[PDB]
Every structure is written in structure tokens, then in C-alpha cells.
Amino acid sequence: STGSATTTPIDSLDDAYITPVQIGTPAQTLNLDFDTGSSDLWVFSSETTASEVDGQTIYTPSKSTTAKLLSGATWSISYGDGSSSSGDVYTDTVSVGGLTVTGQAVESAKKVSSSFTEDSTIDGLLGLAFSTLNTVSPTQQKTFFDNAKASLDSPVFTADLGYHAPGTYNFGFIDTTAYTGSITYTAVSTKQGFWEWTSTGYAVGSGTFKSTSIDGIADTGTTLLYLPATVVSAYWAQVSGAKSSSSVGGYVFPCSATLPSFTFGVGSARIVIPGDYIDFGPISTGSSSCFGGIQSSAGIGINIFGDVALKAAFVVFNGATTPTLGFASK
Template sequence: MVHSTATLALFSAVLGAVSAVPAPQPGRFTVNQTRNANFKRHGPAQVAKTYLKYGRPVPSELAAALGMTNAKRSKGSVVSSPQEYDSEWLTPVTIGTPAQTLNLDFDSGSSDLWVFSTDTSSRYVNGQTQYSPSKSSSASKISNAKWSIAYGDGSSSSGIVYTDVVTIGGLSVSKQAVESAQTVSSSFTQESDLDGLLGLAFSTLNTVTPTQQKTWFDNIKSSLDSPLFAVDFKAGGVPGSYDFGYIDSSKYTGSITYATVSTRQGFWEFVASGYAVGSGSFNTVVSAYWSTVSGSRNDNSAGGYTFPCSATLPDFTFGVGTARIVIPGEYINYAPYTSTTCFGGIQSSSGIGINIFGDVALKAAYVVFDTNGPRIGWASKSL
């Protein structure tokens, strides 16, 4: 998740998940995304999930829209599918000795590595793989350490903390803080294929008390050739990749343009230099985007902007310094809402207070998260 101080929300939620590719050399490695076959895109649910993630109440019209959708499911007109709230990409990560494999989300909008575990009350478990510290010879409980994350619906996830070996792409942190859930928000309980989250934001966001813990990336970055990671997401359900410790010049065109990152809130936050819709001027107001789409409307019954699925959406351009990143219009068609109406991939984030560049934007570029600076780099690529 990338944040901007400008006026835009291009959702959705987390960075996704990966499977390891053998490291070409020590200090750098690439991991490829692995798609959750159960995932089904559902626009209102993903917007609500974003509000909850950032501890904000879901807007009443969006909550009502989800209530209506749930009612339709109960009547049988829409197939009941908790996967609509799921994460699209799942991540095999190994924890402990011997290794236990759990599927985690990589999330650049948080800084906790938390998992379902044998400490998790059975009423919160719904088929997830559970980390068992008692079966790991390298696990050690941190005395008196606790963690807790509150969500906008009043729910929370919380628990105790261990240190253990955590390995991704062949590189291991021997004493990584692993936050073991005792209670879990129902939104995560519904995601039966998701075993936890791995945060990639700055460690100042970590919720462990009384002593904050470092993220896996902060612990491993000194072992990398460069203290950075880069993402190359793809559209159309095609697996993308993450590069840790290096920049792969074959994955982008032209040059990378960097923007300074503010760590004040612990996020990868930068200032976009402007926006344009279609072939309009670069300073076009973002809210004008949907006004260019015939038949689009801010639909209270859907909890956001919808449009006729037959419509051709204009491209959306945003600036990073003097560079321009173009998001193709077809990427902004997030998902069908009804048989003829689709849900937009650009939605308001006014109730969150920050603006989020999620996978809709990330799929349109090669993006570098560099802790030197810190800074974030964007480059165009072949789409």
C-alpha cells in the first residue's frame, strides 16, 4: 500500500503474496506472486476492508450496501462467498525449526508480522494453518510482550509475541518477532486461506508493547545488496513479482523517478505532483474522472462509483516529480457489481484521511521502495 498526500484512492488493499524463486546470488532474490484460487473480486467489500484496516468506520452508505448484498446472498440470488473479502495473493512463508509454512499477505501499509497460531481461540479459526511455537525448537516467548490492532468496526486482533526463524526467498531472520494471535477480527476469520500478515511499512507502526519490534524487512535489509524492495504487479490475474535487494532493469522502460517519502505516519507516503484524466490537462481535478464516463454515478446502493460495464474508461495519469505514470482505463474496471454494472477502481478515501495507491496503480508501473532516503521510485513499463 502506497500513500499520497494528494487527492486519490486507487484501491485495493495489500501488496499480495509470493512464492520464492532461487536467489541469483546472496543479498538479492525475487519472489513470484501466487494467486488465491478462491479469491473473487467484490468492490464494496474491498473498499470496506480498506476502511477497517485503517481503523476508520465504514461509511453508512457502504455499510448499507454490504448489508443489502448479504441479504441477497441469504435469499439465494447471490452465491454466498466469504472469498469476496479474501486477499487475492497468498504468501508461503516459513517460520520455526523445523519449518512451518503459512500463507501470509505482504502489506506495505502495516508493520506487524502476525499469524493464526495454537494460541488462537478455536472460535476465531476457520481452516487457517496455525503456527505452533511449541513445535519449534527456535521459538522463544517474549515476556510480557503484547500486540493489538484495532479496526474501524470496533473489532480487533491481538495476542502475545515470540521470536523465531522466519525465512523468505532463502534469506532468514533468526529472531524475528512473530505476533501470535489469541483473538482475531471476524474479517480475518472469514479468510480461511489467509494465515496472517507480514507488514512492510516502517517499524514505527509496529504495535508490540512495551517494546516495538522491527519488521522482517528492517531486520534483513542489512544483508541485502541494497536496502530496498521493488514490485512488478500484473493485470488480468497474471502473477507479478517482488525483487528484494536489487532493481531489475528488464522490468521497466525509461528511467525511475523518485519522490521523497515522509515516514511521519509510518507509511510509504509521498506527494504526487498532479493528475490528468484521459487527454485532459495535467491539473484536472480527480473528482472529474467519473464525470467523463457516461452512465457512471456515485451509487449509494453500491457504496461507491459504478458505471455501465460496456463503457470505455479513460486512462488516468498521475505525476511523480516530472514523470508521468499512466493507468490504463481497463485497469480501473475493478469488478462486476451486477450483470450490467461494474464497480470502479477509483473511489473516495475522504473518510480515511489518507489517499491510497493500491494494486490498481501498482499494476501500471515498476515501483521501488527504497529505505535509503527513504524514497519511492516509479517507472513506466510494458503493459
């Protein structure tokens, strides 16, 4: 089997991407944030504290003839950005882009943090990291990809995120029309539950490539590119007036600037992030100071190849017995 679904930016900045997902019978379609940095499929629901729901579409398990309470199961998750959610668990039929899994754990939110409430466009998350990170207790549950894997034509999914435009998540096949040149594959460590890999270096604009190992994660659920402070300083030093602002919480730059590109290495191959992809717009409405899309990972504990980086590539998440990651230009 295969599946193919369009993923759409939630706003004009590509702050996140949403992908329609069919849950239950008859189908209830929710727009979920596909997140290769976590492993829970959770949704706003009829069980979510009413004051914490503001415009989201909810899953109502009592209206699904295939929903079954997973007795005694609960979940609770905290994300890197300090947001969180928790609740109980159903199993139900879940379909993405024509690919169907029966018995998928659908984690129903009883509580969500303010950042989720405040984002009316995201109805929940669909985790695509390794199932070892799944938070369901006392019986850990599998991700949608893990459940689907054995049925897929090939045990892979691909992320093809657009810049200020829709893109595609495919399951079970590699669309050879969706990228240019060749896909370069690179080793993955699953030790922390992530799609963790080592970039071979970077360049800023038309500058020389610096060969250096940068361990980090391919994370579709993180907006920005988080790299070591040395690398980030070297990038922003090429932008007149750019500075790290403690009050804003990272690098900002004059909105009048033309940003240089940023290149990262994948083995001997190179992925070029155009300068425009690094512009996240005014820090507040009407400001001439703009948010940078490349930020320090120094306070995180891990480097994160988030959407800013991934959207510059066609990315293969290869779930073979030994997982790997593939990157191509597009």
C-alpha cells in the same frame, strides 16, 4: 544477501496478493499479505480462537525448535477497513524468497475479526511500513525489512504486482529487466510511519495532465486507489452512467462501460493505469452494476495509492538513511 518471492492474487479481481513465507524450524509455510501500509508480521496460529479459523494455514510455535515466547509481549491492530486482530508474540526464523531473518517477531493471533476469518486465502500479514507503527507492547518490534536491511546487498525492496497475474517482491536488489525506461525517484516523509510521498498530478484518459500536488501513501495492502473527491469526480464523469452510491459505499458504473485510463505523476514522469485495472466487477453476483477501482479518500484522512495504482508500476521502496520511493513503467 537478497530474496525474491512470487506474489499471487487471491482471486480473479486482485482483491489482495499473497506471498509464501517460511516460519520456524522445520519451516512452516504460510501465505501472507505483504502490506507496505502497516508494520506487524502476524499470523493465524495454534493459539487463534478455533471458531475464528476457517481454512487458513496456522503457525504452531510449539512445533518450531527455534520459536521463543517473547515474554510479556502483546499486540493489537486495527486496519483502515475496520478489521482487527490481536495476540501474543514469539521470535522465530523467517525467510522470504531465500532471505532469512533470525529473531523476527512473529505475532501470533489469539483473536481475528470476521473479515480475516472469512478470507481463507490469507494466513496473516507481513508489514513493510516503518517500524515506528509496530503495535507490540511493551517493547516495539522491528519489521522483517528493518531486520534484514543491514544484511541486504542494497537497503531496498521492490513491489512488482501483476494485473490478474502473479508478480514479484524482491529484497536487496533492483531487477533492471523488470521495468521499461527509467525509475523516477521521489521524496518520502516517514512522519506518519508510511511510505508517504507527493504525486505531481493526474490525467483522465487522453485528457490533459493536471499539475497538482497529491500527498498519499504507497500501500500494497489496500486494494483500491483512494484520491481526493475532486479528482475522483473528474474521473467518473468520463464514464456514462457512473455514480457514487451511498448504499454500495462508493462509485459504481455500468458493467457495459469501457473505462478510461488514469495517469498519475511521479515528478516529471507519468504512470498510466489502464482502464481495465479500474474494474472490480459486479457489486453482487449477476448484477450489471460494477465496483469502481478509484474511490474518494474524503472519509479516510489520507490518499492511498493502493494496488490499482501500484500494479501499473515497478515500485522501489528505498530504505536508505533518507528513504525514497521509485516508480517505473513496465
